[PDB]
Amino acid sequence: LGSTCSSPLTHGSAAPGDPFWLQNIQHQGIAAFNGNPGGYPVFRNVKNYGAKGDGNTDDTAAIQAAINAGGRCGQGCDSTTTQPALVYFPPGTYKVSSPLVVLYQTQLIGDAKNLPTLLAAPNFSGIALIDADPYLAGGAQYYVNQNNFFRSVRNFVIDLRQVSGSATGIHWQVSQATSLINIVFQMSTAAGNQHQGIFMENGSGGFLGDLVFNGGNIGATFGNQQFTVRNLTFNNANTAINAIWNWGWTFQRITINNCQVGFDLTQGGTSNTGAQGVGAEAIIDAVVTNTQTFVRWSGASSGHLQGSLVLNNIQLTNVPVAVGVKGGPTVLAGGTTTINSWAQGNVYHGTNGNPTFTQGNIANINRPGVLLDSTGRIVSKSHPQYTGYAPSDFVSVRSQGAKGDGHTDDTQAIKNVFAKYAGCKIIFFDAGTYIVTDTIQIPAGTQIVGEVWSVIMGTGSKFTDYNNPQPVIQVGAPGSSGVVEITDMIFTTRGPAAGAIIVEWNVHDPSGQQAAAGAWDTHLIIGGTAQSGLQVGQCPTSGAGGNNCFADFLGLHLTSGSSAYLEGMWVWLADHDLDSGGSQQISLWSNGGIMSESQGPVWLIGTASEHHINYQYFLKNAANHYIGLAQTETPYFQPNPNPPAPFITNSNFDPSQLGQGDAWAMTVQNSHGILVFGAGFYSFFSAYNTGCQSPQNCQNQIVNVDSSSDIAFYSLTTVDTTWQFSVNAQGVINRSNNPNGFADTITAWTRN
Numbered sequence: 001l002g003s004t005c006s007s008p009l010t011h012g013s014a015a016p017g018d019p020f021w022l023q024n025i026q027h028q029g030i031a032a033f034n035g036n037p038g039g040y041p042v043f044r045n046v047k048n049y050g051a052k053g054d055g056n057t058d059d060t061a062a063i064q065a066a067i068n069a070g071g072r073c074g075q076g077c078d079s080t081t082t083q084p085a086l087v088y089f090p091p092g093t094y095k096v097s098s099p100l101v102v103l104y105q106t107q108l109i110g111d112a113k114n115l116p117t118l119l120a121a122p123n124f125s126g127i128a129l130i131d132a133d134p135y136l137a138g139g140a141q142y143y144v145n146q147n148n149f150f151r152s153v154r155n156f157v158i159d160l161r162q163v164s165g166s167a168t169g170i171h172w173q174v175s176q177a178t179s180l181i182n183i184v185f186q187m188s189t190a191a192g193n194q195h196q197g198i199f200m201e202n203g204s205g206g207f208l209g210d211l212v213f214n215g216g217n218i219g220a221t222f223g224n225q226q227f228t229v230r231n232l233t234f235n236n237a238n239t240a241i242n243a244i245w246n247w248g249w250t251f252q253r254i255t256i257n258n259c260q261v262g263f264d265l266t267q268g269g270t271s272n273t274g275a276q277g278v279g280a281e282a283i284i285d286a287v288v289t290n291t292q293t294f295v296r297w298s299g300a301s302s303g304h305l306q307g308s309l310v311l312n313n314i315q316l317t318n319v320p321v322a323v324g325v326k327g328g329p330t331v332l333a334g335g336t337t338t339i340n341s342w343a344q345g346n347v348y349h350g351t352n353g354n355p356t357f358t359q360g361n362i363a364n365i366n367r368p369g370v371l372l373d374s375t376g377r378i379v380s381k382s383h384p385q386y387t388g389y390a391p392s393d394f395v396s397v398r399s400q401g402a403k404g405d406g407h408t409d410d411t412q413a414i415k416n417v418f419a420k421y422a423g424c425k426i427i428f429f430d431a432g433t434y435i436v437t438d439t440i441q442i443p444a445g446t447q448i449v450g451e452v453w454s455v456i457m458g459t460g461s462k463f464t465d466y467n468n469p470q471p472v473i474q475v476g477a478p479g480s481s482g483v484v485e486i487t488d489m490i491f492t493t494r495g496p497a498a499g500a501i502i503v504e505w506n507v508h509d510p511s512g513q514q515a516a517a518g519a520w521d522t523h524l525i526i527g528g529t530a531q532s533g534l535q536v537g538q539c540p541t542s543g544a545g546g547n548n549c550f551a552d553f554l555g556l557h558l559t560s561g562s563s564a565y566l567e568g569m570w571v572w573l574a575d576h577d578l579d580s581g582g583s584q585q586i587s588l589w590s591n592g593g594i595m596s597e598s599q600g601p602v603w604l605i606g607t608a609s610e611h612h613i614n615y616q617y618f619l620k621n622a623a624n625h626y627i628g629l630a631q632t633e634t635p636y637f638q639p640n641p642n643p644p645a646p647f648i649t650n651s652n653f654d655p656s657q658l659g660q661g662d663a664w665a666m667t668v669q670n671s672h673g674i675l676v677f678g679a680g681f682y683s684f685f686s687a688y689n690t691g692c693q694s695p696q697n698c699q700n701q702i703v704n705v706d707s708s709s710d711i712a713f714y715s716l717t718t719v720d721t722t723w724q725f726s727v728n729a730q731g732v733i734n735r736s737n738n739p740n741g742f743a744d745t746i747t748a749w750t751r752n
């Protein structure tokens with residue numbers, strides 16, 4: 001506990017009628033590497049830019065000014081980390097008549113106590129009320145969809161009911177480090193209406209959750225490589241989810257009430273040169289009621305894989321068809337029943353490389369008890385927003401002397417803040433970049449909150465020695481337990497930093513509070529950003545930057561006694577430069593992405609780890625993990641050089657069996673109670689050359705397990721890898737058995 005208090009802060013001090021704390025907290029954020037840090041506003045209240053919120057005045061322009069102020073990353077700019085915006089909406093009804101363009105690095109946030117309404121004018125025109133990637137003349141766009149990062153929308157009612165024709169709430173064409181949180185969509189239920197909550201046509205996601213859709217022809221149209229979706233509820237839609245294509249998604253805690261079709265899945269071809277449909281859906285903990293068909297495939301499967309489905313713990317009440325084909329036969333009869341574990345696709349066991357094509361029950365999926373809540377379902381916990389807390393319940397790091405200017409050493413100021421306030425006040429990291437040169441230990445009990453781009457950036461000699469790696473951030477002391485909630489933070493390095501363990505996570509849940517220790521909208525954005533020392537100017541793809549281009553040793557280290565609920569966390573070793581212009585590829589060196597030795601519970605909900613040398617995920621002597629979906633990419637320079645270079649072998653942090661020319665996506669040693677429920681593990685290059693994509697042999701192996709680990713994989717999708725699955729570094733499952741469009745999919749693997 002911090003020295004300023006004697007009992008922990010366990011609830012907020014706000015009066016019931018006070019506005020949400022974010023409105024009146026002091027606004028002190030800085031964009032450290034902006035052209036004008038002293039004049040560029042991070043926080044923008046829409047009402048300060050002329051918005052009335054009276055439901056009659058057209059507020060479109062005023063909101064757009066709140067978004068646009070300061071000279072931001074719009075047309076002609078690829079991406080940025082230096083032009084953030086938190087666009088804030090106090091309660092009210094905001095009438096809008098054309099799309100709100102949510103520029104790169106923008107969050108739209110409403111009052112969480114009394115959700116503001118975005119009200120579509122009867123004459124609304126444009127792609128959607130909120131547009132994260134506008135289309136221009138000739139079908140060019142503001143941003144490349146696969147690079148469309150750093151976007152959030154939180155705490156709104158989006159009301160389309162005044163629009164007589166077609167209308168869409170959100171054009172959510174996005175990739176990683178994005179979120180939708182706590183939105184209610186209100187749409188028409190009139191026969192023939194053309195309302196649609198979300199339209200997403202492509203991208204590389206991503207996490208979204210805690211949404212409610214009321215009415216409409218379509219709740220959400222989804223098309224994207226991969227995404228994790230948690231706690232979506234659809235009421236009275238014609239089609240809840242129109243899934244047009246993917247490589248693979250995970251849907252957790254979905255509720256569908258009174259719809260015609262729950263999941264309408266488009267079946268595509270199996271060739272990587274053919275039509276792409278929905279490769280794979282993994283659905284866990286669903287409740288479906290009074291709905292004609294729960295899952296509908298657009299075409300039938302004929303004794304071989306062509307679109308994968310895994311269903312786990314599905315409660316149906318008056319749902320005649322559990323799994324059906326559009327204008328075709330029932331595949332799984334519904335009614336009123338609970339589906340334990342069911343699959344469509346190729347099922348595998350042990351070292352048997354030959355598929356069992358299945359459309360039927362599979363062995364009950366094991367769900368370790370510690371990963372389940374009192375209702376027996378995978379834990380579901382939203383981004384903590386402290387809705388009952390007053391501004392006085394927070395302490396500002398700026399007010400306590402942390403500059404956040406990307407230059408001043410803020411190590412002592414930050415240490416002092418934790419020493420004084422941990423557990424006494426919510427720690428508010430005003431937007432900025434905070435240079436630290438020693439370990440920042442976040443005590444057990446602490447709650448920390450950022451502001452769009454709040455970065456702790458470790459650098460200097462404490463972090464440069466790969467023979468003696470050291471933690472930049474320490475989440476709890478070793479052996480600690482308690483609440484640790486981290487929201488909207490970035491943790492990273494200023495290079496070179498060959499010894500940095502960016503986050504060492506030690507704390508465990510206290511008794512009786514699951515997921516008390518966790519992170520949301522919190523990412524490790526490693527290199528590729530302004531004044532990181534890890535940009536194209538320092539680290540060209542030639543590799544000429546050499547020893548200057550060590551970015552970290554390890555992204556995330558979950559230690560033996562820890563637990564963690566990590567939602568949407570991207571542990572990204574930069575493959576390209578976000579700030580120099582032109583999205584130029586770069587070569588940076590990270591030894592490994594995520595290593596867990598935790599005995600659990602660990603929930604990795606929509607996490608990703610990309611471009612690390614030895615592995616993206618390494619589970620070493622771990623237990624009780626729920627992981628879904630997990631997504632990975634191999635670094636683009638491999639196999640030039642082969643792992644572990646330019647690091648050296650380290651028996652403490654490396655797996656026993658190093659990657660064969662390329663990093664493992666996931667490698668597992670001596671672990672038990674591991675459930676991987678949706679995975680997207682990809683390889684796109686051989687030393688920056690894309691030729692391997694056609695023969696689909698960019699790397700030879702990608703997932704490794706030892707002989708004894710108690711682990712199961714469901715809906716494991718890989719890209720351009722010969723052996724999708726290995727035991728003891730010998731390929732067992734060949735991609736030739738599982739072609740599923742652009743990607744290849746293993747529907748289930750178990751040890752026995």
Ligand SMILES: *[C@@H]1O[C@H](CO)[C@@H](O[C@@H]2O[C@H](CO)[C@@H](O[C@@H]3O[C@H](CO)[C@@H](O)[C@H](O)[C@@H]3O)[C@H](O)[C@H]2NC(C)=O)[C@H](O)[C@H]1NC(C)=O
Pocket residue numbers: 181182183184209210211212231253380381382387
């Ligand atoms: C699924 O997502 C929905 C939408 O965010 C979640 O519903 C929301 O949950 C919060 C937290 O419980 C509710 O706030 C509470 O309201 C009650 C009633 O006034 C109050 O007593 C509490 O102190 C708290 O403020 C909120 O009403 C509710 N919002 C909506 C639109 O339903 C839900 O919790 C999520 N469920 C899971 C399993 O993650």
Ligand code: NA
Pocket residue numbers: 076077078582
């Ligand atoms: Na460009």
Ligand code: NA
Pocket residue numbers: 557558559560597
């Ligand atoms: Na360790």
Ligand SMILES: [Zn+2]
Pocket residue numbers: 383384385449487488
């Ligand atoms: Zn927050």
Ligand SMILES: [Zn+2]
Pocket residue numbers: 575576
């Ligand atoms: Zn890139």
Ligand SMILES: [Zn+2]
Pocket residue numbers: 508562563599600601
């Ligand atoms: Zn435990």
